[PDB]
Amino acid sequence: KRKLIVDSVKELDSKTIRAQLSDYSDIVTTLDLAPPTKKLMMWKETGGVEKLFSLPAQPLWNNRLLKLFTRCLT
Amino acid sequence: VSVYDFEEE
Amino acid sequence: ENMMLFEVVKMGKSAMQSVVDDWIESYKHDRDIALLDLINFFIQCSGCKGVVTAEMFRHMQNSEIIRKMTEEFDEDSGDYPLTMAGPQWKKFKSSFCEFIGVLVRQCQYSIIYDEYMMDTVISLLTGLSDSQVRAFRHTSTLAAMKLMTALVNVALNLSINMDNTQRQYEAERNKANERLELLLQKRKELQENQDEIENMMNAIFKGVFVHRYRDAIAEIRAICIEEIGIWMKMYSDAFLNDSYLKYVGWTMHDKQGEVRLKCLTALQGLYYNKELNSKLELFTSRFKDRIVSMTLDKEYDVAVQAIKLLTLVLQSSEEVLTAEDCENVYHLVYSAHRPVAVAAGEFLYKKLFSGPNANLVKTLVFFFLESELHEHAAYLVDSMWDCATELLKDWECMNSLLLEEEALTDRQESALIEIMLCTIRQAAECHPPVGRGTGKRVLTAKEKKTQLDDRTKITELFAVALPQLLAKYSVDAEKVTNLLQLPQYFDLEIYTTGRLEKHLDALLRQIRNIVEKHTDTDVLEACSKTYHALCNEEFTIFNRVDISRSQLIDELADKFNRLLEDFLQEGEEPDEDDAYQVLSTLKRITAFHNAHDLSKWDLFACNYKLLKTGIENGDMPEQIVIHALQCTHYVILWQLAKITESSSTKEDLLRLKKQMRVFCQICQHYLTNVNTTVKEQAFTILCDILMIFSHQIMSGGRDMLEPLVYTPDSSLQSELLSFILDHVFIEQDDEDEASKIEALHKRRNLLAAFCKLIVYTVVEMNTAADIFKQYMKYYNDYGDIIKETMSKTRQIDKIQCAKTLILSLQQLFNEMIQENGYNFDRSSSTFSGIKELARRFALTFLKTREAIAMLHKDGIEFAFKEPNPQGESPPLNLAFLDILSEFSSKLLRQDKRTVYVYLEKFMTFQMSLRREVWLPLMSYRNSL
């Protein structure tokens, strides 16, 4: 049948608008906070599967040791 | 404030 | 032609006034023909491919025209011009709107009053605005709304020429009586035309706007709100009222973001206007709580505008906002989304930040401490880098504020170092902190100079001040660890080239002081990372710093030896105080042995000696164990770094391989220890060791090192997995949010450590079975790790992956029976989930064809592998294939009977006769 979009309903009724005015709790939210500890900031930088699968489980702070791990991934 | 009271329809 | 006009505006190439003017001359020669093409232009701008005729225009009312245009619409899809994507349709949307607008403005001095063209158009627009056909109702509503704005412009012109002529009438009265009379008739004529333009405006408003602003379709809702924002802005004297603004008030509560966004931009427009409106006061008193509530809009863009608007409010009036509201806005500088965070940053700057910067710095510190939401200041500093950059870079002001003499509390000094250290990091590294910044955006020329100037200035200022500050706070571990991170941002050439050698020595001493006087884990990693950053071979302080570094480790290494000489004598039963002494030097060595090549001191022995003493007697403080494991690990990596060449050696390697070999066995037995942290530590290093010393240590033209042949044993392969099941996959519930997420991240780190061994063939891939099965149970916690590991196993051996997958399912099957039994209800929501899991697993499937084959061919063997002991020989594993049936969809059509021949080698002729309980068999074969 025809693909022409016919709207059976054209307007929101008055009662629904009264409802929208008296409750917006479903269109506000709680504050999504940024990482609030230094270590939680680190786990976001080195988190995500990409970094976790290319970095060692015990952190190596000098690139020469790090390289010894990176070199062995393909 | 009363003009902003929704009473349409 | 009718189509000529529509295709023009879409493809005008024109000064649109040319089309309008050409249209207008066609109207003066014959009005009826020109209106027919204007009607047909609206119809056609809706996407309708039908045509209104002259006879239709003459005798047919619009409701009948519209019914016939719906019949002949002859659309091919549900799209109409205003809903198409691409720049040619956004251009068309603009041509469309400007055409309506220029048309009306060019008819405004005569034709518009001819009581014929505009009543036709308006009547047509509002009939189409009432149509269930969305293309017509959306397009007409856009046309009416732009139509209406033009009329507002016309009335505003009329109002101006009514007052100019009032000024010309009063002037000629104030100074001939037949000209005062021509002016008062001109004033009356203009008033008539004002009355006709209000009639039309009222027709659109009551006929289109008050219905269509509450349209079911949100985009139609947003077209009306944006345009009422425009009239209120353009003709404030007539339209900036409560009786127009109420629509914006109400619609702020719309359930769709695009709509709420247009409300706020509309109100934003009425405020940079900013001129003393009082009817705005009544609106803001009534809707202020809602506007504040939209600082936490589910949709981010609305939250930004909400904040931005609220900052305008502050300017316009300030008294209005009230404290609780202001604090709710301030909290948002800590938000994850930088466009919100800097909006609130601007609100915070404006409201409460207005040497000189001495006290502004203290108030930032007071704010950061009073808002106990973040322990650090990275995100506070980044919310305000953009507005108050002038202040956050006054380090000299912060510098001597921590030194040169109510004074400063101790929490405030610690807040100021972190705040200062944050400004330094964001100034040297010109990016936001993690989760705030863009994707590797590179730097403007001006950004680059600003990035090299700041950096020297930091270097020069704090080369001198850093050693003083460290001395004053050497004892606080919180403030040393911060202070010790500055040199990693300095330019070290400046140390040499600008008479600074004295200060570098003065600090390097104060750094060797803190390592001696501290045992905190963070304090010591800061000491080691900085010494690393100062021992750069690209710069000329390497020798000066290296000498001090060699003296530091000569002291600690010789002491450590002396402590182990005493601590491990057979009868010198060491106490807990002797245990802290060992732990203190070990920890200091450990921290330095990570970032510095310490093979010259040959420390394998001491670590080895103690690890072997904790295993034999089992009495050994966790922290000595953990740290010894770490130190040993650093000793083997560092050696393997110097096996970079064999310019080095051909005989030392035999010793290096033996130490990795024994260290592996030592870690393996610390892995079954009773203490959690000791296990996690042995496990962590083992995963790294096994990956480092894999076969992968030489495909990259690294073939020299093959003799380093450590493959894990069957014993350890499973004890490694034992660790994962007991400490990564744990009972789930369903010190508040911060600590649990820390724990989740460490559990993720451990799981990834092992899956790295799976994806890289270190351990047999069969072990992933007990990990894949947890994909739905642990989706949010470990979902992403499990599905990238199983797709990496897929990518390397697609059918082995399928063979481990259904054993994962086979291992959720025998879990389900293990506690309950063989008569278990076979439609349980436990069973149903295992079925759903399998459905999702199936979707993972080009060489898929034998994969799915053996897929089935193992589920088949598992489904008749054990027969019923006291029953018709139903089997024990009959039902498990209702699960496999969810894999039937992905099968080939040809092997959807090779399924059978193999199915039939196992299925007796008698089974198929039987049904009731045997049903899993029936719709397993029916799937094929």
Side-chain angles (χ1 to χ4, degrees), chain C residues 803-847:
Chain C
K803 196 141 160 272
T804 52
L805 273 169
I806 294 295
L807 196 288
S808 312
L809 278 170
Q810 288 172 246
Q811 216 267 324
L812 285 173
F813 196 79
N814 87 301
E815 265 173 54
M816 156 145 43
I817 79 204
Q818 242 288 352
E819 298 281 333
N820 339 21
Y822 284 109
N823 330 287
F824 72 75
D825 113 48
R826 324 124 250 279
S827 183
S828 187
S829 281
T830 314
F831 188 96
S832 324
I834 309 176
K835 168 174 95 216
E836 172 40 33
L837 177 63
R839 168 196 108 68
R840 249 161 116 58
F841 267 177
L843 312 186
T844 63
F845 296 100
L846 200 64
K847 294 181 257 189

Side-chain angles (χ1 to χ4, degrees), chain C residues 666-854:
Chain C
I666 299 167
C667 287
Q668 184 183 29
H669 302 304
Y670 280 106
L671 197 145
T672 324
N673 194 271
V674 66
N675 189 290
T676 70
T677 79
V678 171
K679 296 173 105 207
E680 302 190 353
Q681 184 60 86
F683 175 84
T684 287
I685 288 173
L686 228 53
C687 286
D688 295 353
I689 281 297
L690 297 179
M691 193 59 46
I692 278 168
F693 288 92
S694 76
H695 43 82
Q696 294 272 328
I697 190 174
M698 82 208 84
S699 177
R702 277 167 326 250
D703 217 301
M704 142 185 183
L705 290 180
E706 205 289 330
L708 302 180
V709 177
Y710 201 102
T711 311
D713 289 341
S714 314
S715 91
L716 171 66
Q717 278 207 41
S718 201
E719 207 87 74
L720 286 179
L721 183 81
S722 96
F723 176 83
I724 284 293
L725 304 159
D726 288 331
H727 298 309
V728 160
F729 306 113
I730 322 158
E731 186 213 278
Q732 334 163 324
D733 301 331
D734 308 86
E735 314 336 319
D736 225 17
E737 274 259 79
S739 36
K740 153 56 149 67
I741 302 202
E742 294 202 354
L744 178 44
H745 276 109
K746 181 60 200 254
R747 290 199 305 279
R748 292 177 97 255
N749 186 67
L750 302 149
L751 175 43
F754 181 68
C755 298
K756 281 187 284 258
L757 304 177
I758 278 167
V759 313
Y760 274 103
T761 88
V762 185
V763 316
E764 186 97 32
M765 202 195 82
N766 67 352
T767 61
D770 297 3
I771 287 150
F772 290 170
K773 58 190 200 206
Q774 319 276 24
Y775 180 52
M776 226 156 117
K777 194 177 183 167
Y778 294 81
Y779 186 79
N780 296 126
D781 290 8
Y782 318 106
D784 55 339
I785 305 174
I786 299 169
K787 81 196 214 137
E788 187 66 297
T789 195
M790 83 196 330
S791 283
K792 211 145 300 305
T793 64
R794 216 172 63 104
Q795 266 190 36
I796 296 172
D797 196 317
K798 290 275 159 191
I799 186 150
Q800 204 166 22
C801 178
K803 196 141 160 272
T804 52
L805 273 169
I806 294 295
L807 196 288
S808 312
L809 278 170
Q810 288 172 246
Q811 216 267 324
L812 285 173
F813 196 79
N814 87 301
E815 265 173 54
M816 156 145 43
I817 79 204
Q818 242 288 352
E819 298 281 333
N820 339 21
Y822 284 109
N823 330 287
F824 72 75
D825 113 48
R826 324 124 250 279
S827 183
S828 187
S829 281
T830 314
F831 188 96
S832 324
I834 309 176
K835 168 174 95 216
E836 172 40 33
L837 177 63
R839 168 196 108 68
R840 249 161 116 58
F841 267 177
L843 312 186
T844 63
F845 296 100
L846 200 64
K847 294 181 257 189
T848 76
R849 303 93 146 109
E850 66 280 344
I852 185 91
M854 187 145 216

Side-chain angles (χ1 to χ4, degrees), chain C residues 378-597:
Chain C
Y379 295 101
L380 171 55
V381 157
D382 170 65
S383 306
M384 266 170 290
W385 205 86
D386 301 334
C387 63
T389 167
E390 296 90 67
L391 166 75
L392 304 169
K393 290 161 85 126
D394 193 2
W395 302 295
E396 203 257 15
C397 165
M398 300 179 239
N399 170 65
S400 268
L401 200 160
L402 295 135
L403 303 168
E404 284 290 52
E405 192 276 293
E406 303 184 53
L408 289 305
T409 79
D410 61 314
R411 284 227 91 157
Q412 287 155 26
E413 280 175 340
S414 54
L416 184 55
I417 59 130
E418 167 76 22
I419 288 170
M420 180 212 305
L421 168 69
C422 281
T423 62
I424 291 148
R425 172 219 66 241
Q426 191 144 351
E429 330 176 333
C430 214
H431 64 74
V434 80
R436 290 276 188 87
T438 61
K440 298 177 189 249
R441 226 191 252 159
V442 182
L443 296 181
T444 304
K446 171 114 173 135
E447 276 166 332
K448 300 214 208 171
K449 261 141 192 196
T450 287
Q451 155 206 44
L452 301 187
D453 188 277
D454 53 349
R455 198 197 226 275
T456 78
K457 297 214 308 190
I458 294 183
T459 309
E460 144 198 315
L461 198 167
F462 277 106
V464 162
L466 179 60
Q468 308 185 237
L469 291 145
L470 275 171
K472 302 301 199 68
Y473 309 102
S474 274
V475 67
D476 208 289
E478 254 191 343
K479 307 157 170 128
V480 295
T481 67
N482 280 155
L483 290 166
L484 286 156
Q485 271 128 13
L486 301 198
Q488 320 203 26
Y489 306 107
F490 293 175
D491 163 299
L492 297 187
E493 155 203 312
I494 294 169
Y495 249 136
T496 89
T497 82
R499 87 207 96 154
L500 291 149
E501 291 91 318
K502 178 241 137 142
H503 297 282
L504 177 63
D505 282 309
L507 171 72
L508 280 162
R509 290 197 280 88
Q510 205 86 45
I511 286 175
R512 86 167 285 260
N513 296 119
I514 65 169
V515 311
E516 284 167 358
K517 307 185 301 206
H518 270 286
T519 81
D520 187 273
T521 63
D522 291 320
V523 168
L524 294 177
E525 93 170 35
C527 293
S528 195
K529 265 299 249 191
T530 296
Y531 253 102
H532 169 225
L534 299 176
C535 291
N536 191 227
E537 313 213 62
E538 311 162 11
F539 279 151
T540 84
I541 304 183
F542 189 124
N543 303 60
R544 175 165 210 109
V545 175
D546 185 338
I547 280 160
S548 64
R549 184 228 298 182
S550 85
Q551 173 161 10
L552 182 52
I553 312 177
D554 270 332
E555 183 160 27
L556 278 99
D558 258 310
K559 287 304 96 201
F560 198 46
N561 271 285
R562 294 294 90 169
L563 286 97
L564 279 305
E565 175 202 39
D566 197 2
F567 189 72
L568 293 167
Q569 205 49 257
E570 285 64 271
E572 184 33 76
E573 302 213 86
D575 51 281
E576 43 262 29
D577 295 77
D578 281 334
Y580 188 64
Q581 288 288 298
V582 47
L583 180 67
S584 283
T585 76
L586 174 63
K587 286 182 69 151
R588 295 168 176 132
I589 280 172
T590 308
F592 272 91
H593 206 330
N594 195 326
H596 298 103
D597 186 350

Side-chain angles (χ1 to χ4, degrees), chain C residues 581-684:
Chain C
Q581 288 288 298
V582 47
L583 180 67
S584 283
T585 76
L586 174 63
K587 286 182 69 151
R588 295 168 176 132
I589 280 172
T590 308
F592 272 91
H593 206 330
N594 195 326
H596 298 103
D597 186 350
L598 305 197
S599 294
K600 214 152 251 293
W601 286 259
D602 183 4
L603 286 189
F604 175 82
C606 304
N607 292 290
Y608 174 52
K609 279 139 69 189
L610 197 151
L611 290 175
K612 85 148 199 197
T613 296
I615 190 82
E616 289 174 357
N617 303 344
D619 73 325
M620 194 54 75
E622 67 170 36
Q623 288 285 93
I624 308 200
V625 168
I626 284 174
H627 279 103
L629 285 164
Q630 292 206 42
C631 203
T632 302
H633 185 40
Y634 304 145
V635 178
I636 297 162
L637 306 197
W638 269 122
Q639 266 106 36
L640 186 63
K642 290 226 145 272
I643 306 283
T644 167
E645 314 157 342
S646 266
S647 147
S648 76
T649 181
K650 30 209 165 304
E651 60 118 359
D652 285 309
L653 188 132
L654 294 179
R655 304 327 203 151
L656 175 62
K657 170 155 160 116
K658 89 108 175 171
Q659 291 185 152
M660 180 277 315
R661 268 243 162 79
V662 47
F663 182 53
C664 269
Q665 203 58 37
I666 299 167
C667 287
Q668 184 183 29
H669 302 304
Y670 280 106
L671 197 145
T672 324
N673 194 271
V674 66
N675 189 290
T676 70
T677 79
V678 171
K679 296 173 105 207
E680 302 190 353
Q681 184 60 86
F683 175 84
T684 287

